[PDB]
From Swiss-Prot:
Changing K11R: Influences plasma cholesterol levels; associated with increased total cholesterol and non-high-density lipoprotein cholesterol. It comes from Homo sapiens. Its main location: endoplasmic reticulum. The lineage of its organism: Eukaryota, Metazoa, Chordata, Craniata, Vertebrata. The chain holds residues 35 to 369 of 417 of the full protein. Belongs to the phytoene/squalene synthase family. This is Squalene synthase.
Length: 335
């Protein structure tokens, strides 16, 4: 039932999303192709942004005008040295399918690309300073994905207008995933010369973000870790509100699975020295269980509440964020 070009698009989706691909492919009806194409367009944009072999002077024009390449049938980019470069080399195939989408989906995807390109370009030289700047960066690379998705769901009418309307809750969905990834990936990012932890926070502990990798600094590193985890937890009430408003089963699964994965991850990272020694992962069986069970509101709430309990009873009295961590958890639990 797929055209030659759509066949190729799903192949790329599987190459670049692994799974998530199966969850996307389970989306009902018109949502499936819309989300598949949105994901590929975002992957192409992110592939440009990530590629350190592309100079800033070359990269900014590509970021600024990426949204316009969607309407340029022959546009491709042949000089990338990144893992997912096939989506850039074969962009014509993706944009062809994009232009085959209903106009209501095109409008959303183009708007999000435009906005993300501008934001990504703003952050190419600079690192993240304040907590407000952390939220801004996360909005650009992840919050806008949540906003775009929510707008696609409402436009398809498989979800209520409210989903696309409430940009704040949609933004939180994205910020929660992105902050979680940033926290978990401290060491991987360090070894790759990337710095995403906000300076207003870490500079309360060490003189350079890299100092957290030093074993004499483990206590300070964990305090900072716990502070950032506490920050991320503030998004959980919005995540619960967002999930609670979904009436489509395939949408609910698509939305809930990454969020329950993120919470399991934050729970694993909390007060955990191993964050600064390797990549803390969810144990493989457990990850598949959470995926398999993340299917209705009572079940997801029960999961989040259990993980919040595991954090709560691990909070060291001596942690400088201990009071705040307890308070957000009590807030999450009583929703
Ligand atoms: Ni420009």
């Amino acid at each position: 039932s797929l055209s030659s070009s759509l066949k190729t698009c799903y192949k790329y989706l599987n190459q670049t999303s692994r799974s998530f691909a199966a969850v996307i492919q389970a989306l009902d009806g018109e949502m499936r192709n819309a989300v598949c194409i949105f994901y590929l367009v975002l992957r192409a944009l992110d592939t440009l942004e990530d590629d350190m072999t592309i100079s800033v002077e070359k990269k900014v024009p590509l970021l600024h005008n990426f949204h316009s390449f969607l309407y340029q049938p022959d546009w491709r980019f042949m000089e990338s040295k990144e893992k997912d470069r096939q989506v850039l080399e074969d962009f014509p195939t993706i944009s062809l399918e994009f232009r085959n989408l209903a106009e209501k989906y095109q409008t959303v995807i183009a708007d999000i690309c435009r906005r993300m390109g501008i934001g990504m370009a703003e952050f190419l030289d600079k690192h993240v300073t304040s907590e407000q700047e952390w939220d801004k960066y996360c909005h650009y690379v992840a919050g806008l994905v949540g906003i775009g998705l929510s707008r696609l769901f409402s436009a398809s009418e498989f979800e209520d207008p409210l989903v696309g309307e409430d940009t704040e809750r949609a933004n939180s969905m994205g910020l929660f995933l992105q902050k979680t990834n940033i926290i978990r990936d401290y060491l991987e990012d360090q070894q790759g010369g990337r710095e995403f932890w906000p300076q207003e926070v870490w500079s309360r502990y060490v003189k350079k973000l890299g100092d957290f990798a030093k074993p004499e600094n483990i206590d300070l590193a964990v305090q900072c870790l716990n502070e950032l985890i506490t920050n991320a937890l503030h998004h959980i009430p919005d995540v619960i509100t967002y999930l609670s408003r979904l009436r489509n089963q395939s949408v609910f699964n698509f939305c809930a699975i990454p969020q329950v994965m993120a919470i399991a991850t934050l729970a694993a990272c909390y007060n955990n020295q191993q964050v600064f020694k390797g990549a803390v992962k969810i144990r493989k069986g457990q990850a598949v269980t959470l995926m398999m069970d993340a299917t209705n509101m009572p079940a997801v709430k029960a999961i989040i509440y259990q993980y919040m309990e595991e954090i709560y009873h691990r909070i060291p009295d001596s942690d400088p964020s201990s009071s705040k961590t307890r308070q957000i958890i009590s807030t999450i639990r009583t929703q």
